[PDB]
From a paper:
We determined a 2.25 Å pre-powerstroke state structure of human NM2C, one of the slowest myosins-2 characterized. Crystallization in the presence of the ATP analog ADP⋅VO4 was achieved after truncation of the flexible N-terminal 45 residues extension and the fusion of the NM2C C-terminus to Dictyostelium α-actinin tandem repeats 1 and 2. NM2C pre-powerstroke state characteristics include a closed conformation of the nucleotide-binding motifs switch-1 and −2 in the active site. In this conformation, the characteristic salt bridge between switch-1 R261 and switch-2 E483 that is pivotal for the hydrolysis of ATP is formed. The coordination of the co-crystallized ADP⋅VO4 is similar to other myosin-2 structures in the pre-powerstroke state. The relay helix is in a kinked conformation, the central seven-stranded β-sheet is untwisted, and the converter domain and the adjacent lever arm in the up-position. A slight reduction in the JK-loop length in NM2C causes an 8.8 Å shift between switch-1 and the U50 kDa and abolishes the formation of a tight interaction network with residues of the active site found in other class-2 myosins. Strikingly, NM2C lacks all interactions described for scallop striated muscle myosin-2 due to the replacement of R128 with Q150 and JK-loop shortening. Residue R788 at the interface of converter, Nter, and lever is highly conserved in nonmuscle and smooth muscle myosins-2 and the only connecting hub between structural elements of the L50 kDa and the Nter in NM2C. In NM2C, R788 forms three main chain and five side chain interactions with residues of the SH1-SH2 helix, the converter, and the lever in the pre-powerstroke state in addition to a side chain interaction with a water molecule (2.8 Å).
Numbering used by the authors: 49 to 647, 663 to 875, 880 to 1026
The structure:
């Protein structure tokens, strides 16, 4: 139905791309109707871009879209952004758009939600990127790097702080978090290090209010247990000229403002601070935003306190800040009849010397008439007002720079600790972004060159390294050219020789005795005029010296003071004095003196040379890391929230190579696995694929693939690993987890049935033992079994029933079907176990009744016989015959009553037969009858001892 709408994207000048209903189609032309206005339009068919259906709305990973083109990528980012979803994946990398407002997406609860989660399990975020790199380092034991690309004010710095916040939270050891909830020393410091560098190295530019005027690479060192043990900070190229002058609507470093607006009456007194309008070096007067400085100053002071800094350390730094400023209040003039620089007012040099721990005279003579060394002697030379004013500015810039250098060294002293970093680190690159101002100088050339190099590092990692790895593994692959290669520009700028580049042309020019900024411009237009990335200025148009076609745009360069900013000259006389300074800080910062003194090319490294050398060191360090890219995008040029500018976002996506990176992810194989890891990981999926001992990686994987019946186009067997298309491993991990649960359920449910069927057979045997003590034992056992063995099993019935329903719902393809082991049939056999339990205990009660009915009948029987045995044997006293006359007749009278003994024989035989009658009706041990009958035969015998004593008593008597 959605497809019947015939919806397509067409180019739009205002909106970039806009929805249109495809009205009709030709081989050349196409007619569309705009969705918004209903306007009909005829346009060439090529310009039409296929649109994704609404199920792809606010898609997390763009590499999943059916139709991948500029218009859909733009629309997916725009829809996500206007929902407050600033992060989006694009194949192996992440895209972020700066909102320009506070968003509730960086809390401690959101940090916890990312921990131990897979990239697809959680929405796109900087935390997931951080987590991925952190987990990759922990598993592969490899050094990782997170690289934030982006132009000025895109969000690199803000994102960098979020990486640090994630790692400091999730990767702090039990040491440094002795007590839960309380961050320890290392965590607190690690997080207070960036605000400190931002106070001394950030400034408001037209592009960003908190612009980083230096680059930084931060290394976080971890222990073999994956816990943070230290951090190291590398800074690159501070824009030290911002200390002396700033352009329209721009400010100097923030610290300058925080100190002047935020200090107390006594701190203004002890550091000799003056109002803002009084400083020459603060080009645009008073702070753009005042009052808030008291607050920001106090925060900088507190951060410095969190770091190791002592009160004398902090005071010494602020005194150096005031000293950099005071250099600019020295009003030099010329002489009335000579160009010699004079100092008619010495109040500012009095103040400057007090703050720098020097001698006023020494300073003045060294600044105004510096002594130069030549041929084993010293020559005092005069300086003009310009020469001397330049020296002042060079000294104030060199002092701010050295203060910053010391600041970094100190943070590394606090932060850098425990070198037992466990063969790993996580590098976070935060370089100064690509920038275009009204005037682009040497500083801009240096920043833009570094942005060019990072973009090329993305090109090399995504398209060169990717494809070279396929060639190296013998995979069927034809090289794809995405047209992303920055060699022409990078080379024009940095090539040292053969045709030398701009930086090398600058180096040679400066070391020339008569060279001038103008002659450099002439040399560079002559030598480089024909390069496709260099452009000479056009007459009546470009006020600039030359243009460079950077990847992110054409930038016009004014070479004003480039020979000097590259050669970086300083007064030898003043530098020596600062080295011999009374003050501890000044002397410490000024302790290294190796620079160009007043004076083949030479033996001194230029700023260009030194920065090229430092960037190459950073590149070689990054080359031995597994990088993760974060492409920061600025929505608009107005610092406005909720205002995405399509044409600005499109340019950025274009120079960044965002679509090409996504395409190399869909067209290539982004996931690779070693043969040993594949076999080990997915052997539950192919139980009978590999036989016995195979002793081989490539073939063992080849048999498993064959057994899995995987699509040929979803994988490629290489020389050491298997390459897969995106999402193939993620689905095998779910299939393996499915089989793991299926195997565990099948094992337990088979053991449960084996147990309940064995106990059922023990409950229905009907053989208790014929003893009351045996029938008691069966009752004692069953009652314990009901409250010892039963409960755990009953619980296993409820546990497996839950597991089965959870594994059923989990299958998002074929549902598990097992035999006789369904949870419903587990219930039906357990109900039969309980039905056997009731019928066992009841048969035990009936048995107990009967067994005790038999014991009563036996004791009644044995008591009767015992009395019979006793009476008949006590009757043995019949033997005595010792009597006289008159005793026999009395005995014969007592023998008559004794014939009432049959009265016993009537009752006893009547009782025994009744006992034995009751017995028969139940159970039988009738050996008894033989017993009583023999006692009846023994009773007859004594019945002969009746007549045996009657006849023996019979005597002759009466004679
Ligand atoms: Mg920044």
């Amino acid at each position: 139905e959605w497809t019947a709408r015939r919806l397509v994207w067409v180019p739009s000048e205002l909106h970039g791309f806009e929805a249109a209903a495809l009205r009709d189609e030709g081989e050349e032309e196409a007619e569309v109707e705009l969705a918004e206005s209903g306007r009909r339009l005829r346009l060439p068919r090529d310009q039409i871009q296929r649109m994704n259906p609404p199920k792809f709305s606010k898609a997390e990973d763009m590499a999943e879209l059916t139709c991948l083109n500029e218009a859909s990528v733009l629309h997916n980012l725009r829809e996500r952004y206007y929902s407050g979803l600033i992060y989006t994946y694009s194949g192996l990398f992440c895209v972020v758009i700066n909102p320009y407002k506070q968003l509730p997406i960086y809390t401690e609860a959101i940090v916890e939600m990312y921990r131990g989660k897979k990239r697809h399990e959680v929405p796109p975020h900087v935390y997931a990127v951080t987590e991925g790199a952190y987990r990759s380092m922990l598993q592969d034991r490899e050094d990782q790097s997170i690289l934030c690309t982006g132009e000025s004010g895109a969000g690199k710095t803000e994102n960098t702080k979020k990486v640090i916040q994630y790692l400091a939270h999730v990767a702090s050891s039990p040491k440094g978090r002795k007590e839960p909830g309380v961050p320890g020393e290392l965590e607190r410091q690690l997080l207070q290090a960036n605000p400190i560098l931002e106070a001394f190295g950030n400034a408001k530019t037209v592009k960003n209010d908190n612009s980083s005027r230096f680059g930084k690479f931060i290394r976080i060192n971890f222990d073999v247990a994956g816990y943070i043990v230290g951090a190291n900070i590398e800074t690159y190229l501070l824009e030290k000229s911002r200390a002396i002058r700033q352009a329209k609507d721009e400010c100097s470093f923030h610290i300058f403002y925080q100190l002047l607006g935020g200090a107390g009456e006594q701190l203004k007194a002890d550091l000799l601070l003056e109002p803002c309008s009084h400083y020459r070096f603060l080009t645009n007067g008073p702070s753009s935003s005042p009052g808030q400085e008291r607050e920001l100053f106090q925060e900088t002071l507190e951060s410095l306190r969190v770091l190791g800094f002592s009160h004398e350390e902090i005071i010494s730094m602020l005194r150096m800040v005031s000293a950099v400023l005071q250099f600019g209040n020295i009003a030099l003039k010329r002489e009335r009849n000579t160009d010699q620089a004079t100092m008619p007012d010495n109040t500012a040099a009095q103040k400057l010397c007090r703050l720098l721990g020097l001698g006023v005279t020494d300073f003045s003579r060294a600044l105004l008439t510096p002594r130069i060394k030549v041929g084993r002697d010293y020559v005092q030379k005069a300086q003009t007002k310009e020469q001397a004013d330049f020296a002042l500015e060079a000294l104030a810039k060199a002092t701010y720079e050295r203060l910053f250098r010391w600041l970094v060294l100190r943070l590394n002293r606090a932060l850098d600790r425990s070198p037992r970093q466990g063969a790993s680190f996580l590098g976070i690159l935060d370089i100064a972004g690509f920038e275009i101002f009204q005037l682009n100088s040497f500083e801009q050339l240096c920043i833009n060159y570094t942005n060019e190099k990072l973009q090329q590092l993305f090109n090399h990692t995504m398209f060169v390294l990717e494809q070279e790895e396929y060639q190296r593994e013998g995979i069927p692959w034809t090289f794809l050219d995405f047209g992303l290669d920055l060699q022409p520009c990078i080379d024009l700028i940095e090539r040292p020789a053969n045709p030398p580049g701009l930086l090398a042309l600058l180096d040679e020019e400066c070391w020339f005795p008569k060279a001038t900024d103008k002659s450099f411009v002439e040399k560079v237009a002559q030598e480089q005029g024909g390069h496709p990335k260099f452009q000479r200025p056009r007459h009546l148009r470009d006020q600039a010296d030359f243009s460079v076609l950077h990847y992110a745009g054409k930038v016009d360069y004014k070479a004003n003071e480039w020979l000097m900013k590259n050669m970086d000259p300083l007064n030898d006389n003043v530098a020596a004095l600062l080295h011999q300074s009374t003050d501890r800080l000044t002397a410490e910062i000024w302790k290294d003196v190796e620079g160009i003194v007043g004076l083949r090319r030479g033996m001194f490294r230029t700023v260009g040379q030194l920065y090229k050398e430092s960037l190459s060191r950073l590149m070689a360090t990054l080359s031995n890391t597994n990088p993760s890219f974060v492409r920061c995008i600025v929505p608009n040029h107005e610092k406005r929230a909720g205002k995405l500018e399509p044409r600005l976002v499109l340019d950025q996506l274009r120079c960044n190579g965002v679509l090409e990176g996504i395409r190399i992810c869909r067209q290539g194989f982004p996931n690779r696995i070693l043969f040993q890891e594949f076999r080990q990981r997915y052997e539950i999926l192919t139980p009978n694929a590999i036989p016995k001992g195979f002793m081989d990686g490539k073939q063992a994987c080849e048999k498993m693939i064959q057994a899995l019946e995987l699509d040929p186009n979803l994988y490629r067997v290489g020389q050491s690993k298997i390459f897969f298309r995106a999402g193939v491993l993620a689905q095998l991990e779910e299939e393996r987890a499915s089989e793991q649960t299926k195997s565990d359920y099948l094992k337990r449910a088979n053991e449960l049935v084996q147990w309940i069927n064995d106990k059922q057979a023990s409950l229905e045997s009907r053989d208790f033992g014929d003893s009351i003590e045996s029938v008691q034992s069966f009752m004692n056992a069953h009652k314990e079994y009901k409250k010892t063995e039963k409960p755990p099993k009953g619980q296993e019935v409820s546990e497996l029933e839950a597991i089965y329903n959870s594994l059923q719902t989990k299958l998002r393809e074929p549902f598990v079907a097992p035999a006789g082991l369904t949870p419903n049939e587990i219930d039906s056999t357990w109900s039969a176990l309980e039905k056997a339990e009731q019928e066992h205990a009841e048969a035990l009660r009936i048995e107990l009744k009967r067994q005790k009915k038999i014991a009563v009948l036996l004791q009644k029987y044995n008591r009767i016989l015992k009395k019979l045995e006793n009476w008949a044997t006590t009757k043995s006293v019949y033997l005595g015959s010792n009597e006289t006359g008159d005793s026999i007749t009395a005995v014969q009278a007592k023998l008559k009553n004794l014939e009432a003994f049959d009265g016993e024989c009537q009752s006893l035989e009547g009782q025994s037969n009744s006992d034995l009658l009751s017995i028969l009706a139940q159970l039988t041990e009738l050996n008894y009858n033989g017993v009583p009958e023999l006692t009846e035969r023994k009773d007859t015998f004594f019945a002969q001892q009746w007549t045996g004593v009657k006849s023996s008593a019979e005597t002759y008597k009466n004679t």
